[PDB]
């Protein structure tokens, strides 16, 4: 099997899970604190699936932070057919955990049971905000409380590739701000995390070291837990 949850930080669409029997494809869209996720259950076999009952599971804290609404789907999935489920998503507040999609079905007399995390991460509610450099620096200096900054220094997992790095920052949900850092090698981003009761301004600086293949990533936001979660999600992409 293939489980691709961790490959959805900076993209919205693709195969989430695939094994010999079943493909779970996914498309998703987000705006402000809301999203919609289309789940596509593909029957790769010649036998229908039966009592197919997808269950969304949200761990302890997560249910108060993240609201998911869906309809019942086909109990029966004909062989070679593809069936759609739509999930409506609302971010009530920031969160770390991901919802779990659990899939149980009968198949030719055999009991099938699959679980995979849905790619609903905090940065799906992250929208880009362009701004001039003096505005950026006023905002950065406004976030001067030590709790607001989370910094990570880490070895690159991927090539030190400028154009790919730019696309990652953009696919993450940040604006990419040019000519703000007077070092043209560095990357600066800005956006807003949308929740039900607040917008959280988020600023970031990514500093490559080409010769050492290292990065320093810094994220400043008005909420410690947002700075932390955004930094750990974004650090993992480079």
């Amino acid at each position: 099997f293939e489980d691709n949850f961790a490959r959805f930080v900076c993209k919205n669409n693709g195969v989430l899970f695939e094994n010999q029997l079943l493909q779970i494809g996914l498309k998703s869209e987000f705006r402000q604190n809301l999203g919609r996720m289309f789940i596509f259950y593909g029957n790769k076999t010649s036998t229908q699936f039966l009592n197919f009952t997808p269950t969304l599971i949200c761990a302890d804290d997560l249910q108060t932070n993240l609201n998911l609404q869906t309809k019942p789907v086909d109990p029966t999935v004909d062989g070679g057919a593809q069936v759609q489920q739509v999930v409506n998503i609302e971010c009530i507040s920031d969160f770390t955990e991901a919802p779990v999609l659990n899939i149980q079905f009968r198949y030719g007399g055999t009991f099938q049971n699959v679980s995979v995390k849905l790619p609903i991460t905090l940065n799906k509610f992250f929208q880009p905000t362009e701004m001039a450099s003096q505005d950026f620096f006023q905002r950065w200096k406004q976030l001067s409380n030590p709790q607001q900054e989370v910094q990570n220094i880490f070895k690159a997992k991927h090539p030190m590739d400028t154009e790919i790095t730019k696309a990652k920052i953009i696919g993450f949900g940040s604006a990419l701000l040019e000519e703000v850092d007077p070092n043209p090698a560095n990357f600066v981003g800005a956006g807003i995390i949308h929740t039900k009761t607040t917008q959280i301004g988020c600023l970031l600086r990514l500093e490559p070291n080409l010769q050492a293949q290292m990065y320093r990533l810094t994220l400043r936001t008005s909420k410690d837990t947002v700075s932390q979660r955004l930094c750990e999600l974004l650090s993992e992409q480079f």
């Binding site: 195969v15 695939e18 494809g25 996914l26 498309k27 070679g80 593809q82 759609q84």
Partner: peptide
């Protein structure tokens, strides 16, 4: 009749 919203674990 047959075809899917197509996704792929390989190519591309």
């Amino acid at each position: 009749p047959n075809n899917w919203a197509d996704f792929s674990s390989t190519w591309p």
